[PDB]
């Protein structure tokens, strides 16, 4: 037994090789130690966004906050924080107070339920007052494998173990890389642990899939419910002189049951802890199904009916999740016991071994007497225990698996069966690796995984897309319009970006080229190169990846004071700056606004016409913000006349001709890695400006370069129109002479950004979008297709061929595609004119030296198998909930028996919540999942995302979800206590009050024909909510109503449907009680399903029922309901006298099935029940033509079949990074 | 109902919800009530949450 | 394309060639510079001996 510790709360000869000489003379440009701490923080997952969703008391959480205002001040909150990240004090890059009028806005609050209603008073406060009005009273060294360095030879046999090489590391390792170029190793140890010496960490909230069982794989055990003691002719076994006692297989006692206990017997390394333990039947156990919706009761003891349903299904729940392991194969022991001879025992770990061999094989204790006990292990065949088959191959001397006899239920096994399927299915092997690291690298490293031959090196990691697109939509729903969910996303990435980038900006290069009313100072004090910050120039880029949900556009602020005016240098300067930046914003309006500037300031001067007679041609151009306002005369140039406007009428064709033409660039391993791209191609990366291949020699000025060529057409524009001096009078002196070279100037400035933004800048994105926690998420650009321009992306849950209430995702609410953000244009027009390479610049080095410490800790493997459980979750959930609702899921239902109310949204919506806990907890997440889902109206079918363009057409993505293990498993279990279901503490059918005094044995949960009747008998009567009685008068006998109408006197058969009691418990009590216990009246409740206790007594003394029967009927609620309460005869291996005994509660039908033996010991029972030993449950024993592999699942669980044992290897990612020339 | 001292309201606000085990002029009344027509009727869920 | 293979079993071990094959270390090779600065360590390690 080993042990690894939660994270989270649960349920509870020379040798000296020539080349290993240190001559370290290598210093990593970029730096290593720059680089880590960089992708340190961009490893890290976006905060969960609890706000809106229900606890598991069913009250939402959250303040009580307008959604609108919610909304604005988590912007506020983000903005502000975004100013602490760059040591300002003002924020430059901001999510509130952009241009953009996102009045209607909405952020997820704890102002609102599920059903739309006000948190003014919590749902649970409303629930009690609401039943509080119902209530009624009583009246008054080194390896050659890797080529890395070692210290110790017991580090080297401990060390090559992750190359599959055996011993001839620390499992704490998850992740072990390597340079070749340097002498510098970099290993990912779990966040968790209290060790990070020198150790790199692996944030991301992965779950624990691999987890081992060492113990019996068994959720069911026997146990006595009356001990006794009876004398044998042999007392032991003897040889020689020694002498071994006799140790039987089930308890030696007169009455024997069996109870659902997950693991009693197990002994793992990793404590699931979602146990579902049940007391004997003797004990009360109606907490079992009153741990949900049973909240504002009435009584501490008694469960709600209409709960039930929804209770049994989470229990089932936890019975798959509690026993999700893989069985660990220890070994055994070679046997000489007369009655095993020669049989593999398999011993379990720890001391006295032997001691469990007793209860693992029936067949090994003789048939040293007469007993039930014993005429059962008479009839088992011999040669089916122990070790059955083995694995061919092995390391040493032990088998790498193996087949073996054993104690444990056909249930259970049948799980962990398809749970270990699931598994292996994700397998990947190193060569693989290989491949997806080295493709994503674009070429500049590759990696090398070494490996050893094994086939049980079991490495999941492999899913299909459509999980990854599932899995995705919860994230984009996790948003909900809280910029502080996003902030740090984009922040974070612009700097990772920075540190890993070889362009440099340096304003200096403007201060040189200027070399100084001044047109040339002007527009230095209007740049402001002294100012270093230019998170506006990095965000931007990051921008370009979470297009989807974010829209990056220029800060109102940076456009003209009132307006502005062509006559005002000032404002002119203006106008350049932020022509020269818009581009690099992803606002699909970018160009219109770019138009109306000019045209703002044109006013008095030049003049287009406007298609509005409301709109004129001063509507700032700040307001263009969607589609609905591009002005016809963009559309159609031809309508600006080169008379009334020549000007705004070349602004206009350089827009059309020259603006910047989006692109696509292919990124990732699709094949290993999958991808969660939904509305663009799995491998494609899209990007808003032209790529072109990588060259450092490339010139300065090269108009062909989309930007560059931009930067020219806006200055010589300017030219033109300050040329002639035509649009600026009250200008004393001609500045023409200056004014110019001044845009000259700027124009052949010889600033490398455009070289890079086009050639490198790709590049570094692709490298690093697949290693990114929160995946790409963008919607096409399209330049000036008006139609095709996006403008709403909403997410469903319901299927396409129904019709529900529509339910916007907020994400719909924003004016834009996505959350508005601000940026400078100052900032990013200055780095566009002034970046610079190193001179001694060589890229096949430079990033060698960027790629290496960051994918060295990378996370990608641990998000991949999240996303494959974040899925199993969303798929399970559905499964679940549209059990306990109305959904037009197709599911085969098999607890319809059970009752249950119809779910309102509220009510799933808690249910959720705990299916919800139970998997983190189980999983040992304790980050998000599926929490955004329950924001509302969780009694969902499909999870489905799309985006709408301005001509109206969508595009609708709906992810082809595949199969669940978690989802069918649950499903299994539930088909299986469709028959089982006593052993899990649950009756089935109704139950009879009425008196029976007799002395005979039978047991009241199997009862004789002729004291049960039924609806479609002679006699009866059938009653209904309207059974209003009425007292006799003098004399005459009081009567209830029929459901037929008719009044009928208290006494013979009714039927009553548990309600008509609950509603009227008090009342019943008091005119019926008299009647029931003395009289001759006799009730059939209906119920369903009901919880059970039992009460055994000694059969030859008065034993009256009537004080359980009575404190039932007393306790029962329009809330609560304690367990029923049987009496039953305790069974006896001898004659003995009888004596009557009063009972008042029978079964309609048997339940008795977890009787496993009466009087065990004894050669047989002679009065009271006489049950012997179920030999269906053992069928591989006593039934010779049964095949070693055959079930008989559902109807049947077998306690003893073949258990498959396994004993895999689970080693690190390792990774030789080498570079290239 | 907002406010305390509410537990009152829910009852004189449905009728239809009273026990009928008497046969009571009241009783009788509800008793003779069509079940289906108390709480919430119909409503326009626009936004999610 | 150069990439190295590690030996087992008493195998030898070995380097890629350029046009796909993979031979042993021993006889004639050509490396332009560039290929070993970008391997110092791995290579100094692997061939030196
Ligand atoms: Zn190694």
Redesign the pocket.
């Known amino acids: 037994m080993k042990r690894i510790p939660r994270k989270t709360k649960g349920k509870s000869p020379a040798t000296t090789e020539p080349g290993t000489s240190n001559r370290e003379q290598y210093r990593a440009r970029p730096g290593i130690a720059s680089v880590q701490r960089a992708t340190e923080s961009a490893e890290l997952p976006m905060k969960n966004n609890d706000e809106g969703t229900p606890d598991k008391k069913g009250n939402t959480r959250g303040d009580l906050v307008n959604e609108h205002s919610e909304a604005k001040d988590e912007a506020d909150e983000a903005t502000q924080k975004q100013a602490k990240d760059t040591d300002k004090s003002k924020a430059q890059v901001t999510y509130s107070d952009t241009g953009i009028n996102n009045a209607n806005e909405l952020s997820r609050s704890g102002n609102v339920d599920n059903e739309g209603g006000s948190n003014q008073k919590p749902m649970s406060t409303r629930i009690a007052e609401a039943t509080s009005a119902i209530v009624s009273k009583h009246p008054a060294y080194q390896?050659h494998?890797?080529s890395?360095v070692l210290f110790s030879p017991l580090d080297l046999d401990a060390?090559?173990a992750?190359?599959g090489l055996h011993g001839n590391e620390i499992q704490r390792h998850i992740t072990e890389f390597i340079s070749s170029w340097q002498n510098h190793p970099i290993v990912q140890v779990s966040a968790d642990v209290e060790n990070k010496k020198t150790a790199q960490l692996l944030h991301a909230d992965t779950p624990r899939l691999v987890t081992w069982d060492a113990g019996l794989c068994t959720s069911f055990k026997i146990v006595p419910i009356v001990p006794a003691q009876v004398p044998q002719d042999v007392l032991a076994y003897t040889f020689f002189t020694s002498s071994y006692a006799i140790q039987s297989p089930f308890p030696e006692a007169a009455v024997s049951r069996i109870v659902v206990h997950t693991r009693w017997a197990s002994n793992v390394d990793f404590d699931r802890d979602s146990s579902v333990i049940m007391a004997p039947p003797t004990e009360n156990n109606i907490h079992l199904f009153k741990q949900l919706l049973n909240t504002e009761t009435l009584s501490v003891r008694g469960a709600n009916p209409l709960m039930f349903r929804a209770n049994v299904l989470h229990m089932l729940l936890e019975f798959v999740l509690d026993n999700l392991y893989l069985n660990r194969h220890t070994g055994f022991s070679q046997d000489h016991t007369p009655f095993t001879e020669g049989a593999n025992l398999r011993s379990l770990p720890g001391p006295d071994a032997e001691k469990w061999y007793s209860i693992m094989y029936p067949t090994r204790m003789g048939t040293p007497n007469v007993s039930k006990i014993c005429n059962f292990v008479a009839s088992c065949v011999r040669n089916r225990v122990g070790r059955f088959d083995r694995a061919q191959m092995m390391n040493g001397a032990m088998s790498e698996w193996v087949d073996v006899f054993e104690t444990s239920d056909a249930l259970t096994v049948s799980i962990r069966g398809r749970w270990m399927a699931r598994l292996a299915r994700m397998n990947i092997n190193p060569t693989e690796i290989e491949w997806a690291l080295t493709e994503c690298a674009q070429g500049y490293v590759t990696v090398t995984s070494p490996y050893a031959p094994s086939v049980n090196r079991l490495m999941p990691y492999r899913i299909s897309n459509a999980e990854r697109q599932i899995s995705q939509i919860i994230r984009i729903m996790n948003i909900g319009n809280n910029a502080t969910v996003i902030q740090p996303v984009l922040q974070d990435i612009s700097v990772l970006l920075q540190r890993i980038s070889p362009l440099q900006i340096d304003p200096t290069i403007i201060s040189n080229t200027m070399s100084t009313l001044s047109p040339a100072s002007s527009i230095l004090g209007k740049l402001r190169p002294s100012n270093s910050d230019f998170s506006s120039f990095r965000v931007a880029l990051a921008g370009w990846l979470y297009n989807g949900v974010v829209t990056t556009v220029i800060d109102d602020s940076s456009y003209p004071k009132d307006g502005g005016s062509v006559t005002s240098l000032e404002n002119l300067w203006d106008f350049f700056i932020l022509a020269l930046a818009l581009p690099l914003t992803t606002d699909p309006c970018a160009p219109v606004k770019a138009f109306m500037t000019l045209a703002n300031m044109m006013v008095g001067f030049e003049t287009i016409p406007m298609d509005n007679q409301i709109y004129t041609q001063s509507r700032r151009a700040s307001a263009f913000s969607t589609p609905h306002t591009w002005p016809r005369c963009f559309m159609n140039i031809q309508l600006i006349s080169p008379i009334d406007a020549p000007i705004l009428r070349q602004w206009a064709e350089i827009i059309h001709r020259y603006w910047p033409n989006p692109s696509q660039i292919r990124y990732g391993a699709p094949n290993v890695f999958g991808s969660a791209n939904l509305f663009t191609p799995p491998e494609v990366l899209l990007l808003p400006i032209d790529h072109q291949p990588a060259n450092v020699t490339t010139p300065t000025l090269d108009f062909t370069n989309e930007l560059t060529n931009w930067r020219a057409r806006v200055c010589e524009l300017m030219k033109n129109l300050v040329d002639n001096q035509r649009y600026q009078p009250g200008w004393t002196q001609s500045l023409v002479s200056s004014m110019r070279g001044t845009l000259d100037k700027l124009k052949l400035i010889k600033s490398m950004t455009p070289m890079y933004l086009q050639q490198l800048a790709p590049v570094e994105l692709a490298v690093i979008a697949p290693m990114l926690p929160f995946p790409p998420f963008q919607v096409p650009y399209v330049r000036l297709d008006r139609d095709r321009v996006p403008t709403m992306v909403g997410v469903t849950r319901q299927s396409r061929d129904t019709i529900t209430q529509p339910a916007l995702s907020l994400s719909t609410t924003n004016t834009t595609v996505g959350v508005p953000l601000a940026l400078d244009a100052r900032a990013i027009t200055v780095a566009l004119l002034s970046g610079k390479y190193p001179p001694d610049l060589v890229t096949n080095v430079w990033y060698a030296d960027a790629i290496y410490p960051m994918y060295a800790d990378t996370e990608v493997f641990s998000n991949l198998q999240r996303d494959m459980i974040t899925c199993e979750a969303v798929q399970t959930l559905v499964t679940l909930v549209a059990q306990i609702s109305e959904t037009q899921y197709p599911v085969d239902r098999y607890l319809d028996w059970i009752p249950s109310l119809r779910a309102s949204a509220a009510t799933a919506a808690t249910f959720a919540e705990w299916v919800n806990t139970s998997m983190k907890t189980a999983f040992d997440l304790s980050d998000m999942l599926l929490e955004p889902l329950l924001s509302g109206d969780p009694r969902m079918t499909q999870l489905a995302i799309q985006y709408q363009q301005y001509n109206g057409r969508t595009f609708n993505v709906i992810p082809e979800m595949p199969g669940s293990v978690i989802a069918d498993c649950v499903q299994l279990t539930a088909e299986v206590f469709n028959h089982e279901y006593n052993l899990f503490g649950i009756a089935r059918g109704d139950i009879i009050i009425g008196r029976v005094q007799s002395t005979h044995l039978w047991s009241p949960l199997a009862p004789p024909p002729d004291l049960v009747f039924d609806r479609d008998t002679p006699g009866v009567h059938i009653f209904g909510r309207d059974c209003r009685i009425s007292f006799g008068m003098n004399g005459a006998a009081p009567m209830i109503r029929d459901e037929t109408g008719m009044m009928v006197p208290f006494e013979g058969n009714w039927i009553f449907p548990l309600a008509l009691w609950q509603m009227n418990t008090r009342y019943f009590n008091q005119q019926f009680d008299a009647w029931i216990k003395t009289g001759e009246l006799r009730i059939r409740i209906e119920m369903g399903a009901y919880p059970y206790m039992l009460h055994y007594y000694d059969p030859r003394q008065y034993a009256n029922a009537w004080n359980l029967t009575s404190a039932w009927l007393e306790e029962i609620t329009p809330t609560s309901i304690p367990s029923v309460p049987f009496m039953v005869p305790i069974s006896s291996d001898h004659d003995i006298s009888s004596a009557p005994a009063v009972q008042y509660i029978i079964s309609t039908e048997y339940n008795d099935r977890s009787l496993f033996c009466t009087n065990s010991s004894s050669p047989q029972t002679i009065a009271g029940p006489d049950k012997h030993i179920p030999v269906e449950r053992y069928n591989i024993l006593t039934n010779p033509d049964a095949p070693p592999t055959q079930i008989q699942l559902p109807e049947v669980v077998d306690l003893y079949n073949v258990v498959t044992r396994y004993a895999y290897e689970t080693p690190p990612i390792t990774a030789v990074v080498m570079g290239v020339p």
Do not use: K
């Open positions: 390896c494998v890797c890395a060390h090559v992750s190359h």
